[PDB]
UniProtKB/Swiss-Prot annotation, chains A, B:
Residues where Phosphoserine is found: S66, S204, S209
Pfam assignment, any one: GST_N
Lipid metabolism in keyword set: yes
SUPFAM superfamilies named among the record's database cross-references: GST C-terminal domain-like (SSF47616), Thioredoxin-like (SSF52833)
Protein family: Belongs to the GST superfamily. Mu family.
Keywords: Cytoplasm, Lipid metabolism, Olfaction, Phosphoprotein, Sensory transduction, Transferase
Subunit organization: Homodimer or heterodimer.
EC numbers on record: 2.5.1.18
Protein name, per record: Glutathione S-transferase Mu 1
Organism per entry: Rattus norvegicus
């Protein structure tokens, strides 16, 4: 089968796991464990990082026969193309391209805060900026059932993850935006998704590694 | 014409400015200036940030007729589709996907170092990791004239910019990798590119804002 490698956390891999499941892909995972503080041992991965034939070794990685991929968005795009989950028009492509990138920025902002030793004092300033982020997603989606338009695309997998993550962080953050709450429900309502969420493989939390100040255990 | 919005520095926008020239695009740029310390006034952008009708306001932005794009990578892909500078086979698409994302990683690394108050302390250690970074681009490229294959694609402009920036930071970094030096020369050799580099519109430095510890003026 295909092989997915990543840490034994949700991290930035959720969308891939979700996409593999929604597609009925035959895959096996390799979930690498990181030790606890203070050394945070990474040996399980480091022992093989340069032994898998990857061009730019990293986690996550996807091995599909002869094809070896790294960079989470590249993996998302490989599986999208294989299953026709890319935009079909120029308008759908542009919306997908922007959301892919926007998701990574809002993911980077969360990471920055959750790895900061000054987390508890930084937190208040971060919470103030949430409503603006959610507003932009809300206005972007509008009345469409999905981010790219009329049909589910690989970018709905990205968007679901980051909205979900922010919602775990600040549970009241979507109260003001009904179309976002509805989007989450719709996504989770997808049969393959609904199924997966009750499976032994589902890994919602922790989000971050042991080094983080939040969702780290 | 098209409008490219960004700060009056090279930043992360060199690939876009270079692709606009390579494609003989009809464009004008709005180069916003940031005030000096202590406040580093951003008002020139901030007064119009939410009045341009951008979905997710940011810099750079591209206005092309009725289309308004943000996210540098989304601007690059939009131009590539526009001008047929994408990969044409699955193989080339995967190569492009990986590079695009790899370049961003390598950029974020340089950025993180450059905006660290402790830059001088940190530099020496950073320099030791360059060779390994350069070696992966070297082996990836191999004997190919361009990163995705036989034809120039948008990812070449991305690759050019990050190898150029690493070379400014450490002038000896490419000596061990002739294929990378040859690539820089081949890229710079593209006719429209040569002409641009001698023009009044070229902006190779500074790379960063005044907030940075290197290439900040
Ligand atoms: N742009 C690339 C970035 C690839 C990348 O940086 N990989 C990290 C793992 S991903 C990151 C992360 C991002 C968000 C939330 C959590 C995590 C995380 C969780 C547990 C442990 C390490 C992490 C990390 O903080 C990794 O550990 N790499 C192997 C190595 O360096 O040898 C991508 O999109 O795919
Ligand atoms: N993922 C996105 C990110 C877009 C984004 O972060 N934009 C920054 C400018 S770009 C960044 C930069 C990155 C690399 C090198 C230099 C810079 C830089 C230079 C001058 C002044 C500000 C910067 C920055 O540190 C900005 O100022 N945004 C408008 C605002 O927030 O209101 C992209 O790829 O497009």
């Amino acid at each position: 089968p295909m092989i997915l490698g990543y840490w034994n956390v949700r991290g930035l891999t959720h969308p891939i796991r979700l996409l593999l499941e929604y597609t009925d892909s035959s895959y096996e995972e390799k979930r690498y464990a990181m030790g606890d503080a203070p050394d945070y041992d990474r040996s399980q991965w480091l022992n093989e990082k340069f032994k898998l034939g990857l061009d730019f070794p990293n986690l996550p990685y996807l091995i599909d026969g002869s094809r070896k991929i790294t960079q989470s968005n590249a993996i998302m795009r490989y599986l999208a193309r294989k299953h026709h989950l890319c935009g079909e028009t120029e308008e759908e492509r542009i919306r997908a391209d922007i959301v892919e990138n926007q998701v990574m920025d809002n993911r980077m902002q969360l990471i920055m805060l959750c790895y900061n030793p000054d987390f508890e004092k930084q937190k208040p300033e971060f919470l103030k900026t949430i409503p603006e982020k959610m507003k932009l997603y809300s206005e972007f989606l509008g009345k469409r059932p999905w981010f790219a338009g009329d049909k589910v695309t690989y970018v709905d997998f990205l968007a679901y993850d980051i909205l979900d993550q922010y919602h775990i962080f600040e549970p009241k953050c979507l109260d003001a935006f009904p179309n976002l709450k509805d989007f989450l429900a719709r996504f989770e309502g997808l049969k393959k998704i609904s199924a997966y969420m009750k499976s032994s493989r589902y890994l919602s939390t922790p989000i971050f590694s042991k080094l983080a100040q939040w969702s780290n255990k």
